[PDB]
Design a binder for this molecule. Structure first.
Ligand SMILES: CC[C@@H]1CO[C@@](C)(CCO)CN1C(=O)c1cc(OC)c2oc(N[C@H](C)c3cccc(Cl)c3)nc2c1
Ligand SMILES: *[C@@H]1O[C@H](CO)[C@@H](O)[C@H](O)[C@H]1NC(C)=O
Lengths: 250, 11, 27
């Protein structure tokens, strides 16, 4: 995250780190949606242009973390993957449409002060909150700028941007399964995700029921925090049919 | 490794 | 049923430092 700040303890207890075993590194962000299911961006796991093709056994899920690099004994919980499910119409070739994947954990994770699932929106939540100007929150352990790495989990709040403005910022084809967020050049505030933040959550706090909802998945940007560019997020509600289907089936 | 070693059980 | 009500925040009626910026954006 660029131009964000250190997370408070327990602020984002659904944040998950995808951690590569060999070599030991940050692969991506993700989020906890129940005691056995973790949501992330497809391209964190599968992306042929960068020769990314991770199998279950290549990765661990680390939950309840705050520090980027420390083993947070008896705070974080580390889980093994049972199975990865990538959206079958994930479009890596063109625009990262349907940049979404699920992971089932081998065993259920115990909830705690530091570990707690985020809510998934329903149609009405999306209609209410996913409006230009409305701010959400993006969290992660990715880089502090485009070209270094934080000691602890980083947060930034960012406004959803008008669809035409998103489109006019990029040469890439933007779909209805994506939204964009970030400040405009004039605004006097800035901030973005950056390398290592992909797959993490864009969350909003419902003012109707005081619960946090994951409205987006960190997907892509042209660089990080550049004037005139925005972040593109997977629209969770639009892919919820798919989410429900994977979880109902498996 | 920038990362602290994880217990052996997880690997 | 308990999704995302944070044990150290909503569960104790404490607010984090910037959630009010989110609220003030919701018209
Ligand atoms: C700028 C256009 C090119 C061709 O088109 C596209 C859609 C990829 C096509 O596969 C995106 N792309 C890329 O260079 C690219 C690709 C990515 O994963 C394959 C990326 O993942 C990220 N993640 C970082 C964290 C980020 C930074 C700022 C905001 C947000 Cl929301 C996310 N940035 C990427 C940029
Ligand atoms: C990714 O790996 C799996 C098995 O590990 C393979 O079946 C799949 O076709 C691979 N895709 C690639 C290399 O694009």
């Amino acid at each position: 995250i660029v131009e964000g700040s250190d997370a408070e303890i327990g602020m984002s207890p659904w944040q998950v780190m995808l951690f590569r075993k060999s070599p030991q590194e940050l692969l991506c962000g993700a989020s906890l949606i129940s005691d056995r299911w973790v949501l992330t961006a497809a391209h964190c796991l599968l992306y042929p242009p960068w020769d990314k093709n991770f199998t279950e056994n290549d990765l661990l899920v680390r939950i309840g973390k705050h520090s980027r690099t420390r083993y947070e004994r008896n705070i974080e919980k580390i889980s093994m993957l049972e199975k990865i499910y990538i959206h079958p119409r994930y479009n890596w070739r063109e625009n990262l449409d349907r940049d979404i994947a699920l992971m089932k954990l081998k065993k259920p994770v115990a909830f705690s002060d530091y570990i707690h699932p985020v809510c998934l929106p329903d149609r009405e939540t999306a209609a209410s909150l996913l409006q230009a100007g409305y701010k959400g929150r993006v969290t992660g352990w990715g880089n502090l700028k485009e070209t270094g790495q934080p000691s602890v989990l980083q947060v930034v709040n960012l406004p959803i941007v008008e669809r035409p403005v998103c489109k006019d910022s990029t040469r890439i084809r933007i779909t209805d399964n994506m939204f964009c967020a970030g400040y405009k050049p004039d605004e006097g505030k800035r901030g973005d995700a950056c390398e290592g933040d992909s797959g993490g959550p864009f969350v909003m706090k419902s003012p109707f029921n005081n619960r946090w909802y994951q409205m987006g998945i960190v997907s892509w940007g042209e660089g990080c925090d550049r004037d005139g560019k925005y972040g593109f997020y997977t629209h969770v509600f639009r892919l919820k049919k798919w989410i429900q289907k994977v979880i109902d089936q498996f | 490794g920038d990362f602290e070693e994880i217990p052996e059980e997880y690997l | 049923a308990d999704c995302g009500l944070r044990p150290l925040f909503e569960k104790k009626s404490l607010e984090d430092k910037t959630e009010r910026e989110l609220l003030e954006s919701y018209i």
